[PDB]
């Protein structure tokens, strides 16, 4: 939820919310609905203090003086707990409209309703193509040829889009997780591996609202009903819930690692239900444009990493209309897939400012909340598919150089 | 299920099954029940061939010759599909008793009803104790002091016995998985990472019967209802289901790796719902005592590994009475926990011979099935708890030597 204070011309200026609503191609009226609703809530919270205030003007000098105004102090003491309710059903009606307002869209964000108008802002890398000596194979056919996944036996076991990693497939995955974690460790990041369970209660306060809520796997189990996490970002957001964080602790840098479960996948390993993910999770103070410097820091770390792997890519800024509710601004790094000659998304990078922080009561007198950003570094299975296509030869695949140490210095996976 | 042929004095000797039943402290009568039930099944399968045989003795020479025996060939052709049913409800009654017979208990197995009488057969390692200079801490208090798990924030997120790994905790876990996988790779093992999902249909044919069936997490999800795997052994067993395997492919050696989910756990990380596991999975021919040599091979690999980590241990042979239904014979490697001065189980090692193979129709003329063995190498979280206790000092923990390369050559985790 956004800050009710960004709606009050008493403390202004609500037109900023109105602009954000326009850019999100969503209700501008709801900004008037909510102002009226706040008006009521703070009236009733004062129509309480009307009774509270009269209350010690009635019990002013009952003993220190006879009088029958103590039949009225029965009406008042009682009245104080009548308005006591009104406040509670005002605030709740206010919260039901407020919950629907997306985060304030940053002015740098391209305004448009369609991802088709999504804006490329940076290129890097020399893109391979099929020549007539080398017809470039797709990840699907390179996996089979290489013998490093069993999607057939995987599908009969876990159902559709289910895979085993096998032999040098498993080493590669593990190779990439450790390259990932050390890469981030060197840049001041602290590992966190969350549980792949989250209580629906907590999840309710997390993710990106009604869009990422009733579309996870359910786990029946032991205590409360639980979800399988879709993204390490979710649990990591819940770390530091209801906590205070001290200016001196910030910034915080968690290299998140977990297995990931998504219901909406659609035999390869790009389009899957289960997969592993390293993520950059970062908390900042809310002032001094600290979260905006941190977005650049994370985006640079994602670029540096895809450069280390020598994977050609392009960076796209996402249109205001495509931003989800938490995100104030967002980049994709889309990486080159030679066989099909398309860019595909391997990284998403978001500044969500205080939007989740305010829900998870993650505090920084008059209520300041911290800024939180999240940036996939590598979905390993996808990243591998990208690596197989870009490093293929006539009779196998060359291992990226940075990943050769974590594979015992092997440099080539031969076709079977 | 055991081989119905091990019950037939026609092909003998059923007393061997009777002995196994005694050693398992279970019904000996059921061996007579089942002989009678097989008798019926093969009678009715012949009371079919009674009709089938008469059938071409009636349709002997109908054309090649008048006669009204073709009113009888109506009774017969029909009768052939009456007994056709009897066979199908005989075999099914036979299967309902047969399903309850545990695997043939190996003669080397100590006969007894109580794990209390579980037989120590080998020691290794010099066990540390609390001296009055060094009071030895437990894994629970070493984790907190070291700052490498958050069981508090973990518990509020995933519910009870839920943990984050953190900083050098995560490196250690990853360190141990890779030490594990390379260790086994050098000994002729091939990585397999299964899916953490299995369709209940398949799981039904897997695990150790009614004891390991209605006690997994349930996953609601997309297609059929699924379980979270309790052990990498389960999926790996389903690999090669309904397949033939060629003498020349055997032996097979899968180093299984997965995350693992158990409902029955009971703040530390020893007694947990989610954890990771490397396992030795091995398939052999059924002859030439090949599975029995393979059990020794795997047991030696488990010993070598706990020696590499310099963890003192003892090997126990499990009493006939404690063997589950799949297991013909079983060892535990129980490792030394100094603070509490107890041995705790870090490895289980089973020869299940053809028991699952016969259910999963995993074939090797007259029906031969392969032998399958399974042996945990490391439950990482437990293995770490063991490592923290045995390598502690006054102001932190020394990293095992073999694990120092996979931690960038760090040799000490300092207390906070």
UniProtKB/Swiss-Prot annotation, chains A, B:
L-serine binds at residues 231-233, 279, 376. It catalyses: tRNA(Ser) + L-serine + ATP = L-seryl-tRNA(Ser) + AMP + diphosphate + H(+). GO terms for biological process: cytoplasmic translation; seryl-tRNA aminoacylation. InterPro entries: aa-tRNA-synt_IIb, aa-tRNA-synth_II, aa-tRNA-synth_II/BPL/LPL, Ser-tRNA-ligase_type_1, Ser-tRNA-synth_1_N, SerRS_1_N_sf, SerRS_core, tRNA-bd_arm. GO terms for molecular function: ATP binding; serine-tRNA ligase activity. ATP binds at residues 262-264, 272, 345-348. Its main location: cytoplasm. It is found in: Cytoplasm, Cytosol. PROSITE patterns: AA_TRNA_LIGASE_II. PANTHER family: SERYL-TRNA SYNTHETASE. This is Serine--tRNA ligase, cytoplasmic. It comes from Arabidopsis thaliana (Mouse-ear cress).
């Amino acid at each position: 939820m956004v800050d009710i204070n960004l709606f009050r011309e008493e403390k202004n200026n609500p037109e900023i919310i109105r602009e954000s609503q326009r850019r999100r191609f969503a209700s501008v009226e709801i900004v008037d609905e909510i102002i009226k609703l706040d008006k009521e809530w703070r009236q009733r919270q004062f129509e309480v203090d009307s009774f509270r205030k009269e209350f010690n003007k009635l019990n002013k000098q009952v003993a220190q003086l006879a009088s029958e105004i103590i039949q009225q102090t029965e009406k008042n003491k009682q009245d104080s707990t009548a308005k006591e309710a009104e406040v509670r059903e005002a605030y709740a009606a206010l919260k039901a409209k407020l919950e629907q307002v997306g985060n304030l869209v940053h002015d740098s964000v391209p305004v448009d309703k369609d991802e088709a108008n999504n804006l490329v802002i940076k290129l890097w890398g020399e893109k391979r193509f099929s020549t007539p000596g080398l017809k470039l194979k797709n990840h699907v056919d390179l996996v089979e040829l290489l013998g490093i996944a069993d999607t057939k036996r995987g599908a009969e076991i876990a159902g559709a889009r289910g895979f085993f990693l096998k032999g040098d497939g498993l080493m590669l995955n593990q190779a990439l997780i450790n390259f990932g974690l050390t890469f981030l460790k060197k840049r001041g990041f602290t590992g966190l591996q969350p549980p792949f369970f989250m209580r629906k209660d907590v999840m309710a306060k997390c993710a990106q609202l009604a869009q990422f809520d009733e579309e996870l796997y359910k786990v029946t189990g032991e205590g409360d009903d639980k979800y399988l996490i879709a993204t390490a970002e979710q649990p990591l957001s819940a770390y530091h819930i209801d906590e205070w964080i001290h200016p001196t602790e910030l910034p915080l840098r968690y290299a998140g690692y977990s297995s990931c479960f998504r219901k909406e996948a659609g035999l390869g390993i790009f389009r899957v239900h289960q997969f592993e993910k390293i993520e950059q999770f970062c908390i900042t103070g809310p002032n001094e444009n600290a979260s905006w410097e941190m977005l650049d820091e994370m985006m640079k770390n994602s670029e540096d990493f895809y450069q280390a792997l020598k994977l050609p890519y392009q960076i796209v800024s996402i249109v205001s209309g495509a931003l989800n509710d938490a995100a104030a601004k967002k980049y994709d790094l889309e990486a080159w897939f030679p066989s099909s000659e398309t860019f595909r998304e391997l990284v998403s990078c978001s500044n969500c400012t205080d939007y989740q922080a305010r829900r998870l009561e993650i505090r920084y007198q008059t209520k300041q909340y911290v800024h939180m950003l999240n940036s996939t570094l590598t979905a390993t299975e996808r990243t591998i598919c990208c690596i197989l296509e870009n490093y293929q030869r006539e009779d196998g695949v060359d291992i990226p150089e940075v990943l050769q140490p974590f594979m015992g210095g092997e440099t080539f996976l031969p076709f079977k």
